[PDB]
Amino acid sequence: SVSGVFSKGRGIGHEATTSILRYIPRARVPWQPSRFGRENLTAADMARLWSRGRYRDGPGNYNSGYCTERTHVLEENTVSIIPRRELEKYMPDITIGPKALVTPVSLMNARNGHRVTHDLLHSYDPHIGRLGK
């Protein structure tokens, strides 16, 4: 009777240091010896978890434009996603790309330290978006 949110995980350091470092005990946190963070998630699980972070306008949301499911069940009534080609007919296509999201350094100060308009706040310190890398 064992249940688990994630059925598979991967380590951080590869097979060049851990085989020698295992002989030295590590003082893990006493009240939670086993830890399982986002940097320890598998590729698919991490992707599907990161898609659900944004409230809307994100891949996790069923109707945000970036979904991948063929159909979505809504109130016991199936519905079919209108493809991008069919949307284009009556929705004019305006798309600049990654250049639109980014803003110049001179405007970074006015934008309060942000050069990206992405709805996830990007921080330049190497500690907040701290995956394995």
Binding site: R22, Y23, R28, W31, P33
Partner: protein, 239 residues
């Protein structure tokens, strides 16, 4: 699956479970440094004797004193069991540690007519030598208790000076496993909730942890643990 060594039950086999983070007095978690590689009397065991430790004198100082002596530095050779001692350290005077407690109580002439030399005047420097520097440290304790101004211990003593192997006060660094239960003297009761809490003493303590710690050499360390991992009796996430 669940195990008696993985669940959180407070009491195992009738005694307080030592595997609970909440079953230990908070002062145990405080950071501390390993001291098993330090001097025997500098280790944490002699907490009540730490305030009485003597100062140092090294091989360079001892050789310099041997080459160029000075009139007011009494080099006391506090070695017992005269059958063991063979050579004579230069400028040395024999005051055994088993007699120092009464010897320091004698007057000037009272000490001179019994030991063949006068009192160190309680102001001149005294430097104590013994095998392994154990009896010398124990004697320096007594000298400091008698309030001598300058008492120095030569760690290593005649053993390291002459390159012999004499071990006075034969003591083993390792300890026999604690066959009995957890002593009552280590049981801590909370001052507010009145809960019974443990302490790093008796069956489990810092000396046991240090002596159980891994060896510095990798090829020797691999000999202890079996193949395929050093610790496999425990789950993957608890190692």
């Amino acid at each position: 699956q669940a195990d008696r060594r993985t669940r959180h039950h407070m009491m195992v086999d009738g005694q307080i479970n030592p595997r609970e983070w909440f079953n230990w007095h908070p002062k145990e978690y405080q950071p501390w440094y390993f001291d098993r590689h330090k001097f025997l009397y500098e280790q944490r065991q002699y907490a009540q004797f730490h305030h009485l430790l003597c100062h140092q004198v090294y091989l360079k100082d001892m050789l310099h004193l041997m080459r160029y002596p000075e009139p007011y530095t009494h080099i006391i050779d506090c070695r017992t069991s005269t059958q063991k001692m063979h050579r004579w350290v230069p400028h040395s005077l024999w005051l055994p540690r088993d007699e120092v407690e009464y010897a320091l109580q004698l007057s000037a002439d009272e000490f001179l007519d019994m030991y063949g030399f006068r009192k160190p005047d309680k102001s001149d420097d005294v430097i104590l030598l013994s095998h392994n520097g154990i009896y010398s440290e124990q004697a320096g304790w007594e000298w400091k208790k008698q309030f001598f101004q300058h008492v120095y211990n030569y760690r290593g003593g005649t053993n390291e000076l002459f390159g012999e192997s004499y071990s006075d006060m034969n003591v083993s660094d390792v300890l026999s496993p604690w066959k009995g239960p957890f002593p009552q003297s280590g049981v801590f009761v909370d001052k507010w909730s009145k809960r019974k809490v443990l302490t790093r003493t008796g069956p489990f303590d810092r000396q046991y942890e240090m002596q159980d710690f891994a060896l510095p050499d990798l090829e020797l360390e691999k000999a202890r643990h079996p193949e395929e991992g050093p610790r496999q009796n425990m789950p993957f996430g608890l190692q």
